């Protein structure tokens, strides 16, 4: 839903704060569910 | 005047009686509600 | 899950309805003074 909702509204409709959180909540999700045990580890090591 | 505690106190006591300030200020509640939002919309966790 | 989500994506085009109800009032949405499309970021957040 959140992903769809992003197509009915221009950026202007959301707080520049939240817009940022969303990106983060997504990155979390990627790293948590779609990243290799090897990919994660590299990022952590390079302090990304 | 500065030779006697009484004298000094009397003079000071008098000099201050005359100050008469009158300031003009906005509605408190208004400012505290505006600045209020500015904080809420931009803070990530209950800002002290 | 796969099911529900599958039916979900298969139905997103139904959202077309919103697009209509909005586009239906094209003239009303544009021929007026209140509409604008440029984001003036400097606008005080407490005014919104």
Swiss-Prot record, chain A:
Disulfide bonds: none annotated. It comes from the Viruses. It is found in: Virion; Host cytoplasm. Capsid protein which self-assembles to form the inner icosahedral capsid with a T=2 symmetry, and consisting of 60 P3 dimers. Belongs to the phytoreovirus inner capsid protein P3 family. Homodimer. Homomultimer. This is Outer capsid protein P3. It comes from Rice dwarf virus (isolate Akita) (RDV). The lineage of its organism: Viruses, Riboviria, Orthornavirae, Duplornaviricota, Resentoviricetes. The chain holds residues 390 to 437 of 1019 of the full protein.
């Amino acid at each position: 839903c959140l992903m769809l909702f992003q197509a009915l509204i221009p950026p202007s409709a959301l707080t520049a704060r939240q817009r940022l959180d969303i990106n983060n909540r997504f990155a979390y999700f990627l790293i948590k569910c779609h990243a290799t045990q090897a990919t994660t580890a590299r990022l952590v090591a390079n302090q990304v | 005047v500065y030779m006697s505690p009484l004298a000094l106190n009397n003079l000071a006591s008098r000099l201050l009686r005359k100050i008469s300030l009158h300031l003009v200020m906005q509605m408190v509640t208004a400012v505290q509600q505006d600045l209020g939002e500015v904080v809420s919309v931009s803070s990530n966790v209950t800002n002290p | 899950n796969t099911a529900l989500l599958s039916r979900f994506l298969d139905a997103t085009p139904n959202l077309l309805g919103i697009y209509e109800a909005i586009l239906a009032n094209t003239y009303a949405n544009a021929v007026n003074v209140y509409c604008d499309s440029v984001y003036r970021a400097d606008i005080p957040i407490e005014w919104k």
